[PDB]
Amino acid sequence: ARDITLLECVGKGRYGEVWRGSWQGENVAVKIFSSRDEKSWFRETELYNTVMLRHENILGFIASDMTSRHSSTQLWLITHYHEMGSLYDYLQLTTLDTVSCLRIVLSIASGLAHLHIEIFGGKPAIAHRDLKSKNILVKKNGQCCIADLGLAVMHSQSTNQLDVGNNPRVGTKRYMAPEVLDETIQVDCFDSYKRVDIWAFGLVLWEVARRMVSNGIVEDYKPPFYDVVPNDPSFEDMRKVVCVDQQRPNIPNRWFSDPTLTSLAKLMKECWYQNPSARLTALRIKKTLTKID
Amino acid sequence: RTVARDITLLECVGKGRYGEVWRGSWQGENVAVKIFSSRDEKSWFRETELYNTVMLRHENILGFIASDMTSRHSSTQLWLITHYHEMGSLYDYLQLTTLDTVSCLRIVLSIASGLAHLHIEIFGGKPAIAHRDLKSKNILVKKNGQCCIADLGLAVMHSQRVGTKRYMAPEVLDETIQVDCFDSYKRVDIWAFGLVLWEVARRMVSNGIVEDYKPPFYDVVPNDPSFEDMRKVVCVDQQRPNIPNRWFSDPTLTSLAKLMKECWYQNPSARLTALRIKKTLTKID
Ligand SMILES: COc1cc(-c2cncc(-c3ccc(C4CCN(C)CC4)cc3)c2C)cc(OC)c1OC
Ligand SMILES: COc1cc(-c2cncc(-c3ccc(C4CCN(C)CC4)cc3)c2C)cc(OC)c1OC
Ligand SMILES: COc1cc(-c2cncc(-c3ccc(C4CCN(C)CC4)cc3)c2C)cc(OC)c1OC
Ligand SMILES: COc1cc(-c2cncc(-c3ccc(C4CCN(C)CC4)cc3)c2C)cc(OC)c1OC
């Protein structure tokens, strides 16, 4: 029972398109890649070949296909479907209580620690390189899963092998770490890519915490750096604010009246050091969030 | 819209260390489905990366349809789907069939055509490609009498010891191959082409005479030769396949003997190019 029916488009952009489809009488998500992003399709396919990748907080794949007749090629990725959409979509619409806020951020930390930590026997260590709220899906149990492994990079400690792949694509400009924006990142060092993920995770923590109510107050949804860069920021716009101006997202002062938001502000600042080796690990973030409340 | 992905697997036409090849049916049409073993996973990734880079389309290259990866409970299933050629491999065909002058030339010119197409860089186009496992089992026979080259699971691309041991060039066996020079890999293919040309020419009738099908070096190495077995024959003793006297009574086989010796020089840079083999073959008969 391999057939799929495409039912409605739930996303269109430079990446291609995502469809809600029907397969074996279940909803599936079907991504059809743009020609411009063919190397992302292949990288994501290499990543999903890892059976031990599977995790409650990683988007589950069903199949990957490259199809062709004559001169045209289609590139397909079929995954589980999350009708609540991305965390970006969800935060526009909804405020959070303490329980819901911690459940979301701990689930992302759990997914990211699962990616970063090598499993021996297995799964290589994996750095994502494009973590952001559009690449996180919300599940009906109030946990999230991380999506889009097209830029990922794999490392095996046992065999001393680093696979950075071949993909000219770069991460989403708004979420790029200082060392990415100033292009000084150590490209032959696996730990460099984990540290880029931690920066981006800090930004996602900020986006989420803004939406958690405390003392009758909440902030409106805003993307990171909304106050300091143009609407559709360029690479150089982001380099200006992050590297030249040393800007970091502002902590609303109302957070300091709430113990949970005070803990989260501390945690996001430890993701944002210009010095990448100073930043927390995904495991330490997971352990910290496990303890918070 | 409905995306019909069901393929009916009808009969197994190949089983090996690589996995299995099945004749299958998609929407009424024969396809060939290669199901990869864990042993041979990297061949699916390499061929898939190549076709993701350049969608080869040539009458003498096995026609790509799809690369499929399906998640299972405890494994990943990897399928390559191509055109189906019911006559099977050249290896199979030659066991079962003698050739006349026209069929022999049509087979070898079609192989040279496929191989030159792989080897050529085309600008605007395709990268240059070396096959790295050319042999009679990796060539399929079409109903029109032409062949197509199959299995790009070891192929290497360029823009400006993985092969079958019996078909390895001397520079592969003695580890002198200039691994930094893409032309090295083209020259390894040409050596193998020359062995295939010998396998085919043996089955061409002249003056009521034909040789039995044998694989290259059948008379000097064991049924399943070691790397060392091949090195001693090809590198140390510098043996080459036997050219039977009866060929020198036939103008076509005399010309094909000359061509196969210009594929078997010890010095890789002395060997003919695929394009020069094509031109030579179009002037025979
Ligand atoms: C994978 O292989 C096979 C696929 C198909 C197949 C099925 N539906 C649609 C298509 C198709 C339609 C249209 C376009 C283009 C046309 C021009 N452009 C402006 C827009 C899009 C591309 C593709 C195909 C090719 C048929 C096959 O056999 C008949 C295949 O071979 C087994
Ligand atoms: C990020 O990356 C991938 C995501 C998905 C995916 C999986 N479930 C659900 C979705 C979704 C559904 C619906 C909406 C709503 C949002 C608000 N509303 C106004 C419009 C529609 C949003 C999102 C998606 C996009 C699949 C992918 O591959 C198949 C992804 O690529 C790896
Ligand atoms: C995913 O998997 C398999 C798919 C197929 C297959 C079946 N029907 C139709 C198609 C098709 C082709 C092309 C378009 C175009 C339409 C125009 N526009 C520019 C976007 C895209 C749409 C649909 C395909 C590709 C066959 C398979 O096996 C033979 C598949 O499994 C390997
Ligand atoms: C070398 O490589 C690949 C080859 C093929 C492939 C393509 N058409 C047809 C075939 C085939 C059909 C039928 C017979 C036999 C049946 C019994 N009878 C007594 C003689 C004939 C043999 C062979 C194959 C094996 C597909 C592949 O991948 C999908 C290959 O791998 C790239």
From Swiss-Prot, chain A:
Where, in residue ranges, is this chain on the Cytoplasmic side?
1-293
Cofactor(s) needed, names only, are: Mg(2+); Mn(2+)
Provide the residue positions that the database annotates as binding ATP.
10-18, 31
Q: Which reaction is this enzyme known to catalyze?
A: L-threonyl-[receptor-protein] + ATP = O-phospho-L-threonyl-[receptor-protein] + ADP + H(+); L-seryl-[receptor-protein] + ATP = O-phospho-L-seryl-[receptor-protein] + ADP + H(+)
One GO biological process term is: osteoblast differentiation
Q: Its function?
A: Bone morphogenetic protein (BMP) type I receptor that is involved in a wide variety of biological processes, including bone, heart, cartilage, nervous, and reproductive system development and regulation. As a type I receptor, forms heterotetrameric receptor complexes with the type II receptors AMHR2, ACVR2A or ACVR2B. Upon binding of ligands such as BMP7 or GDF2/BMP9 to the heteromeric complexes, type II receptors transphosphorylate ACVR1 intracellular domain. In turn, ACVR1 kinase domain is activated and subsequently phosphorylates SMAD1/5/8 proteins that transduce the signal.
Entry protein name: Activin receptor type-1
